[PDB]
């Protein structure tokens, strides 16, 4: 053997769910319609969804044996450490994950007792809360000239407007110029664009959960291609919000550093494969503090599907005993979420594998030089912001 696996720490975005409460709120009022009612409740795990994340943890629980990370048969407290943003979806998801990759084990998830976990639901927290003038400024600068943005993505827009717009009735949001708005909160948002993103994640999840065309968009959706050219919409959402680099690093800090240690030799605890799921928005605060750009085939740049992983694998050369880091951001296509494809040689993960100068090419991907790889991917995070979180939570 070349190439020792030894530790997995991943970050699991929840899968498919349909609208959320407010996201459903937004887009029915944007575009003067009712939309689709799933047979699962807003916000939560459908089962097409998690048949597509079981499909996806039996062949990493396949792929991880085979490896030599995980030993046969049923883990132990030493082989994986799961948790999971409480949410509904985030729960189910990690069940769903464990469910395919430890078949028939009964695998227990972990989350917290509340409401907010500090990894994930890092507003809720004095250290990760970002500051609303900052913020503003932050979003405002990145956005430069939004009539500028709207107007390149024009054509997008288009495509949107005659998949969700009914003929003749009117369609306030496409209308609407697009402004940095700021709630009482602090929540930042761009008029016009964010909903238009929270529809745009809504024709995506219905495509990838297998609806019916005429439950989508009202049959005017009819191939993935179509839900692939929506996508910079999102793109533009999320570089406008959770990829702003400060919001990014005061929401997202904990989390990296929470992974860069756990990817760690001597991390806590000790396990074999730390598994962490949470949400979209958390996966790209993450993967914006890396600097980790990807653009998977049929999707738009950055973009995170349901059910999809950014993975942090620590392996060891067998000869030299030197240490490596690969890191990667996997996903399934549109079209194997929505056929529940299970994913092999015919129908592979997509995957992209961050890189920098001095990693090398391998037998098992990419590996990069281990402490040059966590001090670049660590570099953009503000340690004030990253309080250090016990990775095991209590029962």
Same mark, same amino acid.
């Given at each position: 053997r070349d190439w020792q696996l030894e530790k997995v720490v991943e970050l699991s975005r929840a899968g498919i769910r349909p609208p959320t409460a407010g996201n459903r709120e937004a887009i029915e009022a944007a575009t003067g319609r009712p939309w689709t009612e799933w047979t699962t409740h807003d916000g939560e795990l459908t089962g097409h969804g998690y048949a597509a994340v079981v499909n996806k943890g039996r062949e990493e629980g396949q792929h991880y044996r085979q490896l030599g990370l995980l030993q *046969?048969?049923?883990?132990?407290?030493?082989?994986?450490?799961?948790? #999971?943003? !409480?949410? $509904?979806?985030?729960?189910?998801?990690?069940?769903?994950?464990?469910?395919?990759? &430890?078949?028939?084990?009964?695998?227990?998830? /972990?989350? *917290?007792?509340?409401?907010?976990?500090?990894?994930?639901?890092?507003?809720? &927290? #004095?250290?990760?809360?970002?500051?609303? @003038?900052? $913020?503003?400024?932050?979003?405002?600068?990145k956005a430069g000239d939004l009539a500028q943005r709207r107007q390149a993505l024009a054509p997008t827009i288009q495509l949107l407007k005659q998949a969700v717009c009914q003929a003749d009735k009117p369609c306030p949001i496409?209308?609407?110029?697009?402004?940095?708005?700021?709630?009482?909160?602090?929540?930042?948002?761009?008029?016009?664009?964010?909903?238009? *993103?929270?529809?745009?994640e809504t024709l995506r999840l219905g495509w990838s959960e297998n609806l019916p065309?005429?439950?989508?968009? =009202?049959?005017?959706?009819?191939? @993935?291609?179509?839900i692939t050219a929506l996508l910079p919409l999102l793109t533009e959402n999320y570089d406008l919000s959770n990829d702003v680099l400060y919001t990014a690093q005061k929401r997202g800090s904990v989390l990296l550093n929470a992974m860069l240690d756990g990817?760690? !030799?001597? #991390?806590?605890?000790? %396990?074999? =494969?730390?598994? +962490?799921? @949470? /949400?979209?928005?958390?996966?790209?605060? %993450?993967?914006?503090?890396?600097?980790?750009? =990807?653009?998977?085939?049929?999707?738009?740049?950055?973009?995170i599907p349901p059910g999809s992983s950014l993975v942090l694998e620590?392996?060891?050369?067998?000869?030299?005993?030197?240490?490596?880091?690969?890191?990667? &951001?996997?996903?399934?296509?549109?079209?194997?979420?929505?056929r529940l494809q299970t994913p092999? #040689?015919? /129908? !592979?993960? +997509?995957? $992209?594998? =961050?890189? $920098?100068?001095?990693?090398?090419?391998?037998?098992?991907?990419?590996?990069?030089?281990?402490?040059?790889?966590i001090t670049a991917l660590g570099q953009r995070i503000d340690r004030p912001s990253a309080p250090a979180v016990a990775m095991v939570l209590p029962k």
């Open positions: *046969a048969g049923c883990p132990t407290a030493e082989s994986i450490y799961v948790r #999971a943003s !409480p949410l $509904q979806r985030t729960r189910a998801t990690a069940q769903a994950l464990v469910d395919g990759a &430890f078949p028939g084990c009964g695998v227990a998830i /972990h989350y *917290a007792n509340g409401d907010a976990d500090p990894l994930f639901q890092t507003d809720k &927290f #004095a250290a990760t809360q970002t500051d609303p @003038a900052r $913020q503003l400024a932050a979003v405002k600068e496409f209308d609407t110029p697009w402004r940095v708005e700021q709630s009482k909160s602090g929540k930042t948002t761009i008029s016009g664009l964010s909903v238009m *993103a929270n529809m745009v065309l005429s439950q989508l968009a =009202w049959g005017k959706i009819a191939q @993935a291609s179509q990817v760690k !030799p001597e #991390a806590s605890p000790n %396990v074999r =494969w730390l598994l +962490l799921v @949470a /949400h979209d928005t958390n996966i790209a605060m %993450v993967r914006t503090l890396m600097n980790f750009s =990807w653009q998977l085939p049929g999707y738009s740049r950055g973009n620590r392996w060891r050369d067998a000869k030299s005993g030197e240490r490596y880091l690969r890191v990667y &951001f996997q996903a399934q296509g549109l079209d194997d979420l929505r092999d #040689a015919q /129908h !592979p993960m +997509l995957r $992209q594998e =961050w890189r $920098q100068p001095g990693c090398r090419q391998t037998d098992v991907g990419t590996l990069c030089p281990f402490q040059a790889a």
